[PDB]
Nucleic acid binder design. Structure first.
Ligand SMILES: Nc1ncnc2c1ncn2[C@H]1C[C@H](O)[C@]2(COP(=O)(O)OP(=O)(O)OP(=O)(O)O)C[C@H]12
Ligand SMILES: [Ca+2]
Ligand SMILES: [Ca+2]
Ligand SMILES: [Ca+2]
Ligand SMILES: [Ca+2]
Length: 341
DNA sequence: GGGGGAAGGATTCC
DNA sequence: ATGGAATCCTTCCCCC
């Protein structure tokens, strides 16, 4: 088996540049504002110009500005970035029929019955970096190896505009010498847990009793890491299917006033129901971010589908269970439809 | 002893 | 300090 993984370089910022080529060479930060105060909000992504000074995804806009006051701060235009991605995904389906669109800027190609050896692989890699650069004027990074995970690690190593092949013998030196926090699925919480278990490199999972491992990181992560380390991971490329839609908005100010919140809550629903297309969810969740950035949500499943009018009614109820049950002020409120028929 | 769901929270990734 | 979505984990639930 051979996986070719494609990762679109500094994606949103790169789109804003493509759409205004004057931006190239300049620090570019794609911002998501919140309209509480003037520069309230957070950073979505930024180019490598900006990123080289610590301006990354997730920091507040405010921080970013202290660091690079004269950078180009642009507001997020997701609709736009979505149409552009789509076109590249269509283009991608013209190389393998076996394709997993994993995110707005990521995809996996199964190219086993379409190439022999990593030399051919590598070449088809170049054909795609190219075709995209020509068609949609976008740089990407490509990773090639035997499974999705090592395909994706390969890409992570070559970013940006890179390409990298991990062969089977290097996969082995990796398992020995790769930091576990660098494995996909291992956020900061899981990395630290493993540290305490004295698990630093992929190989360390073999030296520990499965039950203790399972006890610390759950059964799924457990078997995931273990199979990865045994050179036995081989999960299949398949058409991902969208299982929930939803909106979340930030309120001008934190509050516990039902009548103050509702106008944000219904706007979330309006946007949500627009985003639904013609899909009918059986389920609805009302999602609150309390003042301390904790998250809490009540939901409900129907035996039928949920009309806009009905969803209004239930969301108001579910909002109340929150305010009743939880005792915090609420900073953000949104909705999420799922269980579509 | 176990299969489903369903709900609430956890964690991750882009 | 945003906003979107997936996955997995525990408990609870009903019932066989
Ligand atoms: N923390 C984040 N918040 C909002 N959007 C995010 C995000 N992290 C990643 N993204 C999006 C936008 C960004 O361009 C992206 C990938 O980031 P990347 O180009 O790899 O740097 C497609 C995701
Ligand atoms: Ca990317
Ligand atoms: Ca990581
Ligand atoms: Ca909590
Ligand atoms: Ca990425």
């Amino acid at each position: 088996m051979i996986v070719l993984f494609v990762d679109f370089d500094y994606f949103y910022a790169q789109v804003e540049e493509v759409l205004n080529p004057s931006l190239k060479g300049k620090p570019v930060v794609v911002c998501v504002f919140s309209g509480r105060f003037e520069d309230s909000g957070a950073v979505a992504t930024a180019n490598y110009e900006a990123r080289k000074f610590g301006v990354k995804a997730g920091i507040p806009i405010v921080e970013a500005k202290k660091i690079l006051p004269n950078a180009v701060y642009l507001p997020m235009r997701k609709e736009v970035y979505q149409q552009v991605s789509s076109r590249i995904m269509n283009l991608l389906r013209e190389y393998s029929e076996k394709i997993e669109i994993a995110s707005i800027d990521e995809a996996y190609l199964d190219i086993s019955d379409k190439v022999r050896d990593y030399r051919e692989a590598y070449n088809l890699g170049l054909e795609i970096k190219n075709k995209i650069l020509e068609k949609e004027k976008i740089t990407v990074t490509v990773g090639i190896s035997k499974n999705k995970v090592f395909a994706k690690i390969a890409a992570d190593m070559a970013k940006p505009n890179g390409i990298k092949v991990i062969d089977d013998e290097e996969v082995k030196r990796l398992i020995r010498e790769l930091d576990i926090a660098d494995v996909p699925g291992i956020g900061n919480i899981t990395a630290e847990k493993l540290k305490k278990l004295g698990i630093n490199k992929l190989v360390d999972t073999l030296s520990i009793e499965f039950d203790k491992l399972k006890g610390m990181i759950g059964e799924a992560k457990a078997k995931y890491l273990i199979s990865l380390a045994r050179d036995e991971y081989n999960e299949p490329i398949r058409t991902r299917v969208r299982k929930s839609i939803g909106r979340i908005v930030t309120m001008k100010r934190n509050s516990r006033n039902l009548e103050e919140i509702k106008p944000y809550l219904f706007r979330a629903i309006e946007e949500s129901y627009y985003k639904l297309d013609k899909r009918i969810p059986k389920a609805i969740h009302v999602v609150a971010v309390t003042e301390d950035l904790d998250i809490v949500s009540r939901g409900r499943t129907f035996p039928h589908g949920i009309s806009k009018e009905t969803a209004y009614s239930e969301s108001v109820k579910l909002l109340q269970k929150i305010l009743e049950e939880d005792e915090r002020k609420i900073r953000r409120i949104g909705v999420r439809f799922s269980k579509f028929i």
